[PDB]
Design an enzyme around this catalytic site. Sequence first.
Site, PDB file in Angstrom:
ATOM      1  N   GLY A   1      -6.521  49.510  69.124  1.00  0.00           N
ATOM      2  CA  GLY A   1      -7.380  50.674  68.881  1.00  0.00           C
ATOM      3  C   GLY A   1      -6.721  52.048  69.074  1.00  0.00           C
TER       4      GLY A   1
ATOM      5  N   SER B   1      -3.890  42.270  67.588  1.00  0.00           N
ATOM      6  CA  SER B   1      -4.950  42.000  66.616  1.00  0.00           C
ATOM      7  C   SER B   1      -4.515  41.003  65.556  1.00  0.00           C
ATOM      8  CB  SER B   1      -5.502  43.246  65.970  1.00  0.00           C
ATOM      9  OG  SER B   1      -4.621  43.588  64.919  1.00  0.00           O
TER      10      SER B   1
ATOM     11  N   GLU C   1       0.212  41.472  75.254  1.00  0.00           N
ATOM     12  CA  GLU C   1      -0.754  42.287  74.577  1.00  0.00           C
ATOM     13  C   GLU C   1      -0.163  43.663  74.246  1.00  0.00           C
ATOM     14  OE1 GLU C   1      -4.977  42.242  76.037  1.00  0.00           O
ATOM     15  OE2 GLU C   1      -3.723  42.064  77.943  1.00  0.00           O
TER      16      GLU C   1
ATOM     17  N   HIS D   1      -5.708  40.404  82.309  1.00  0.00           N
ATOM     18  CA  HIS D   1      -6.074  40.942  81.034  1.00  0.00           C
ATOM     19  C   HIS D   1      -5.941  42.441  80.920  1.00  0.00           C
ATOM     20  CE1 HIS D   1      -8.150  42.039  77.490  1.00  0.00           C
ATOM     21  NE2 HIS D   1      -7.506  40.989  76.990  1.00  0.00           N
TER      22      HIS D   1
ATOM     23  N   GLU E   1      -7.787  44.795  79.713  1.00  0.00           N
ATOM     24  CA  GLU E   1      -8.944  45.607  80.020  1.00  0.00           C
ATOM     25  C   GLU E   1      -9.270  45.559  81.487  1.00  0.00           C
ATOM     26  OE1 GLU E   1     -10.889  43.077  77.102  1.00  0.00           O
ATOM     27  OE2 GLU E   1     -10.946  44.830  75.699  1.00  0.00           O
TER      28      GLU E   1
ATOM     29  N   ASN F   1     -10.655  34.452  73.518  1.00  0.00           N
ATOM     30  CA  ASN F   1     -11.163  35.344  74.543  1.00  0.00           C
ATOM     31  C   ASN F   1     -12.344  36.037  73.919  1.00  0.00           C
ATOM     32  OD1 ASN F   1     -11.729  37.233  76.646  1.00  0.00           O
ATOM     33  ND2 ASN F   1      -9.961  38.591  76.060  1.00  0.00           N
TER      34      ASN F   1
ATOM     35  N   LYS G   1     -14.303  37.776  75.384  1.00  0.00           N
ATOM     36  CA  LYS G   1     -14.628  38.930  76.210  1.00  0.00           C
ATOM     37  C   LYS G   1     -16.093  38.861  76.688  1.00  0.00           C
ATOM     38  CE  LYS G   1     -10.888  41.273  74.118  1.00  0.00           C
ATOM     39  NZ  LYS G   1     -10.326  42.470  73.484  1.00  0.00           N
TER      40      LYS G   1
END
Lengths: 249, 249
Positions: free
Chosen positions: B172, B212, B166, B94, B96, B10, B12
């Site tokens: 983050g 990650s 995910e 996804h 995001e 991905n 992005k």
Amino acid sequence: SKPQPIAAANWKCNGSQQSLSELIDLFNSTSINHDVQCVVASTFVHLAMTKERLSHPKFVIAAQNAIAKSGAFTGEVSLPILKDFGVNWIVLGHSERRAYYGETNEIVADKVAAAVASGFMVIACIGETLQERESGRTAVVVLTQIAAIAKKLKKADWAKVVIAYEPVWAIGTGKVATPQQAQEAHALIRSWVSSKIGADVRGELRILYGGSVNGKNARTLYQQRDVNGFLVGGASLKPEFVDIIKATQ
Amino acid sequence: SKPQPIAAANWKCNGSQQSLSELIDLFNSTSINHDVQCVVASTFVHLAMTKERLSHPKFVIAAQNAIAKSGAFTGEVSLPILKDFGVNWIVLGHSERRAYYGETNEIVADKVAAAVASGFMVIACIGETLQERESGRTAVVVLTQIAAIAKKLKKADWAKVVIAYEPVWAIGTGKVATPQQAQEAHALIRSWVSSKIGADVRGELRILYGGSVNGKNARTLYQQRDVNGFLVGGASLKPEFVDIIKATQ
């Protein structure tokens, strides 16, 4: 009397390699003798094709949208990408995005500001819905919209911006929009620019009509003082788009 | 045992023609000797370039999102437009998209149902936020999501589904998710498929890890009984991706 007209074709969420070719050959073979800027705004996916196919010197390619920064935003496409790719035109703040994609004036001003600053020619869209129109909020509405975009640009920045006035109120509600109606809305915009930025910008500004334009009413619309072109939805997937260019003088 | 893994990239909202070219080249020249399905989710704008270049027999192109039907969606790309273009793999739901684009459980589900009808191969995304995990809402959260996908599905359709967990709570937030932690969540989802749909589907299902990952930690994770590959973020732009594929052991 008037600035350079633009003829804008908004392909939206449509297309096919075979169909889009056909049209591209048609556009290409069109003869245009007057100073006009023709623009084809295609889905991100078809940019490549239209990019290396459009032969016509009167035609440039646009993106229907973007975000300002590259990064972690799955599904999106930014200006840097577009810029590398070779697209220098972009449509932002379209009614469809405003309606279903979270697009606030604050969001549209930022996109616009981002685009201009990175070099793009912009067709910044604005317009009021039937709700606002019936309740007597047209002037509050458009001025707010255009005020918000202005809040981010410098006087010089105006050279990179075009405005498309969309008659939201008349976009699929069963209403009609008369040319006298278009004119007033355009006249508002013109006024405000003239008044808050400078007449010098105002006279160079292009204000497009983003309503319902077909081959018949194209000229009657263009025939109006502050109508400097069009941003065409439906008839832009069709051959009558050529009539639309012709109607800009 | 475990089914065929998926190592998926991905990218992005990132890249230039150059970098993508180089990366792809490296990909083209990588001898993958095991049974794995490699996938490349690029931006819409780069779909063309990737399509033309990715020679590898073990790699497949995918788009980062779409909408179900074509029509008046300025800025959006549809299942039909992709299909036409040659794209049969899609990442839907996804994180995001869920966070910053108002894609809800229902949206995600609908898109998912859609794409599956259209004969697409979907990698659907689920995960809790840090807020949620923190308050022990993991199980309610992860199950509610998968459940919404299932409501719209026919037992048969499962063949086209690929599930990607995910650990947003790790992304983050200065958080590190451990193989132990990953596996618990993957095991949970498996529990729910197995209960709900049937053990047969469960056993065939490919549940990816979308936290990650990188050349080091990839190894250990894949080792877990219920992790069938990865949905990689950052390293999918780097040569580490190679390493990650080979962590597919």
